[PDB]
RNA sequence: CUGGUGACUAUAGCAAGGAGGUCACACCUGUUCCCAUGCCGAACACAGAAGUUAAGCUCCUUAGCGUCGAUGGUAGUCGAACUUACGUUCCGCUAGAGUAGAACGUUGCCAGG
RNA sequence: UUGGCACCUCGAUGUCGGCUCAUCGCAUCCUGGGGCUGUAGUCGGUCCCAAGGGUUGGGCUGUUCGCCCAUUAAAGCGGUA
RNA sequence: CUGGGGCGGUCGCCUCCUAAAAGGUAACGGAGGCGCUCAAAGGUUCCCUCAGAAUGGUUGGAAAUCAUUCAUAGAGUGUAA
RNA sequence: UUAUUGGAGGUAGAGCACUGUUUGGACGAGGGGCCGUUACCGAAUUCAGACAAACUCCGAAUGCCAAUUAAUUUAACUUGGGAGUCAGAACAUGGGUGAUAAGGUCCGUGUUCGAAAGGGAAACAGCCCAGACCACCAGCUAAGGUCCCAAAAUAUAUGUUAAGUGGAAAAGGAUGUGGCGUUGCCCAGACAACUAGGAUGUUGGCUUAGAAGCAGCCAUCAUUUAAAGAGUGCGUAAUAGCUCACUAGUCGAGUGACACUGCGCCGAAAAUGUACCGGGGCUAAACAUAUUACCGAAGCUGUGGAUUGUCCUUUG
């Protein structure tokens, strides 16, 4: 129930493109306790990790130091490549 | 300063880039000017970079 | 045989803006043609009989919001 | 045969057909479904034929989905005319695909059934398919 | 604080619940007078102060509706290179929808308390 | 083939049918070689290889076509202004 | 004028789309209007607010007129847009 | 021309709030066939999902208009003398029309031709590079190229292709071949092969003339199992008969399924002669990705010269 991702800068088109094709989903955290911070993380971690916690369940996502409780608030997907291509994380308060 | 030289013809380029390349000071493929720079003179490069080469 | 009923059109009107924003207008210059009042006369400008927003003074020309959804020019003195 | 029961304009300019599906990607009612993967014009004699193809293949086990519909009118000119002199009469009605759109949807079979249904379907298309399932 | 009168893209509104009445605002009592109703003193107008906070009105609570609204990503696209492919690549710009969230107003002048 | 377009030719690129002379393609009419057959045999059906050669006289009509008579292993389909 | 000419259609003016978010922009492209009307349907002052629905009510019905509530414009604006 | 700032405007996209188009539901004000309750619910409401040149709650990129505006630049306007032009073409792209036909036709935008020679595209106005004042047996480059025709790499490195693909085409068809992932089984012996079994209620029930595992519908259960389907195919008129699934044994190491992709294959028939690389030829001399050279134009440079301007300046 937990996965890290690694921090973003400002990224052009090909920048993306070539995260997506590596394999990484780029990602938002956003949400209580965490200011916004643009993520990668890796897309078949992510899958097992959703597939283990359900499409509600919380994750431990590593961003930077830091661990954040997050949840998928929602998320980006491309269905004639069957391939995720954008999440939002949703850092729940506790 | 900048050394800008036209490195491409200004044949079959639209008449806008001929116009940013005259008013760079650009005369003969291959011309060169000296120029100071500031964001007025780095909008006509950008705009005809394509045909032109920039050295500090 | 075969003929069209179509093929009719009007002589276009010219309408819309006749001067930019922030530019100086002596008075009387026609500012904006329009039917209705797409936008509306402000300060120092007047609305002709068909609609036509014109200056009434010399200015500088300034469209501006008029409310939440509608819009007008005004025309203000130079200092 | 699908078409409308009316339409403001009969003649109408042919719609674009480049870019991608912009709605009406996912299987949204069945469990699965039949998505295109190249563009085409896609009428509505077309979908009669693939409707039945899957349906009779599925022997009304199951329910299926028509997701596309031929909203838009075509002419075409009389049989040997010269150009002009107005456009031509209605011809057909036809729906626009481009990769990504469902065009058909299944539930109520195996999944097995359901690619041979979606399979008989697609051959009577003008576009390459691929098989899809519920998307989570 | 209350009222009058302004400014501001509803972040200001709607809805629901609750509180108030020397003074003020109302409802309210009347139709002699000015004035009025295509009939009606309902309204407008006027005269007035027995009654009432019931309603209006004002204030308080909230996020159900409406309003506002990122970041990130996506569509589109100026320019360039390649290409003829219902195209590709690079750079800049960059939506709409949606998400987080904001929000049950902020203020100028005047007269009273 | 019926057309669409109007690019060469209007100080002329003669137009249908026939005759004479052919020539080329093969998507093969006959003949040669094969697979399958709901191929018993004799016949056929269908598909594949194959263009070497061969592929008729008459009635009617300007006719090309087409129908008809009588044959033939067969009476191929097309291009060459 | 004309995707040869003829035949058919068209010829001036207004509105929309095509028209590529200034303006302009073609085809025998896609749709419609005009050759008026009004003595108030003009000016000005004052006042007013719709269409529709629900529920009650006689002749009265799904719709006539009356009443309350809801109803932000779906009405109306002489005549096309 | 660019930078900055302001503004007009409704396109691309997007969306369904309006006008229309449209797919599945839910629910039902009310009456009817119905006694209350198993049509229509045509109303209204509601959920989810779509479509639009003449729809819009939204809304770019650009382009456009401006600014006591900055940088670069060199035009601009007025008046008067003289004109020509009013058949345009291709290419690219935004669109109409036509058939998302035309070397078609009509507009928008850009380039080139026209009126442009030179290099490349075999040849080839309109494509790509590039604008010839004159001379040179000098140099550097562009597009495009470097095995021979034919100037320059039989260059370097790592892979792909076997189709002369490269050097013409689609739906669709295929144990061609390469890469990156997910995943089932397996020395408690997997896959394949071979040996043996593969049985009983039972010819399941219905139907049928017959229907016995194996025409068609309904089921798809039990017993001994080291396992065996109310049966995977062949076969019979129906039986019969052969066979498979499944299991045990021999053997001993790998063996299947799915997803996204690189490059190939088939589908592929026309007329004078090979004839869909310009030729030879090529297995790289093809393709992909990097790298370093070189060739290559009337482009640019070098040297001399002509004419006309501008500026320093008598001179030059
Ligand atoms: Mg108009
Ligand atoms: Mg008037
Ligand atoms: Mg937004
Ligand atoms: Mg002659
Ligand atoms: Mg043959
Ligand atoms: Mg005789
Ligand atoms: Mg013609
Ligand atoms: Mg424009
Ligand atoms: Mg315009
Ligand atoms: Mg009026
Ligand atoms: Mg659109
Ligand atoms: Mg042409
Ligand atoms: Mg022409
Ligand atoms: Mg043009
Ligand atoms: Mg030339
Ligand atoms: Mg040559
Ligand atoms: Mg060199
Ligand atoms: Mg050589
Ligand atoms: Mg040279
Ligand atoms: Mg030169």
């Keep these: 129930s937990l996965k890290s991702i690694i921090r973003q800068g400002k990224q052009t088109r090909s920048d993306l493109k070539q995260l997506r094709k590596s394999g990484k989903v780029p990602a938002v955290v956003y949400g209580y306790g965490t200011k916004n911070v643009s993520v990668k993380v890796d897309e078949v971690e992510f899958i097992k990790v959703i597939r283990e916690v359900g499409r509600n369940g919380v994750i431990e996502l590593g961003v930077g130091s830091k661990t954040i409780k997050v949840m998928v608030a929602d998320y980006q997907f491309d269905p004639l490549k069957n391939q995720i291509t954008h999440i939002d994380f949703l850092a729940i308060n506790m | ?56 | 045989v075969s003929s069209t009923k179509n093929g009719r059109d009007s002589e276009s009107k010219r309408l819309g803006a006749k001067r930019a924003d922030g530019q100086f207008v002596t008075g009387g210059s026609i500012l904006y043609r329009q039917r209705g009042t797409k936008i509306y006369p402000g300060e120092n400008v007047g609305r002709g009989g068909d609609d036509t927003l014109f200056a009434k003074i010399d200015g500088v020309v300034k469209f501006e919001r008029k409310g939440r959804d509608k819009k007008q020019v005004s025309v203000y003195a130079v200092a | 045969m699908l078409l409308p029961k009316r339409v403001k304009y009969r003649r109408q300019h042919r719609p674009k057909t480049t870019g991608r599906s912009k709605g009406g990607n996912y299987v949204t009612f069945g469990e699965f479904g039949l998505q295109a993967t190249t563009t085409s014009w896609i009428t509505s004699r077309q979908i009669e034929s693939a409707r039945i193809a899957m349906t009779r293949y599925m022997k009304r086990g199951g329910k299926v989905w028509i997701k596309i519909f031929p909203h838009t009118p075509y002419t075409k000119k009389p049989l040997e005319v010269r150009m002009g002199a107005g456009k031509g009469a209605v011809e057909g009605w036809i729906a626009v695909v481009k990769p990504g759109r469902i065009l058909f949807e299944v539930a109520g079979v195996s999944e097995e059934v359901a690619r041979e249904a979606l399979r008989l379907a697609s051959h009577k298309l003008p576009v390459k398919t691929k098989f899809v399932k519920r998307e989570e």
Excluded at chain 2, 25 to 39: A, I, W
């Design chain 2, 1 to 56: 300063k900048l050394q800008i030289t036209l490195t491409r013809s200004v044949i079959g380029r639209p008449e806008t880039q001929r116009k940013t390349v005259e008013a760079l000071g650009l005369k003969k493929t291959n011309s060169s000017v000296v120029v100071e720079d500031n964001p007025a003179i780095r909008g006509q490069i950008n705009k005809v970079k394509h045909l032109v080469t920039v050295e500090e």
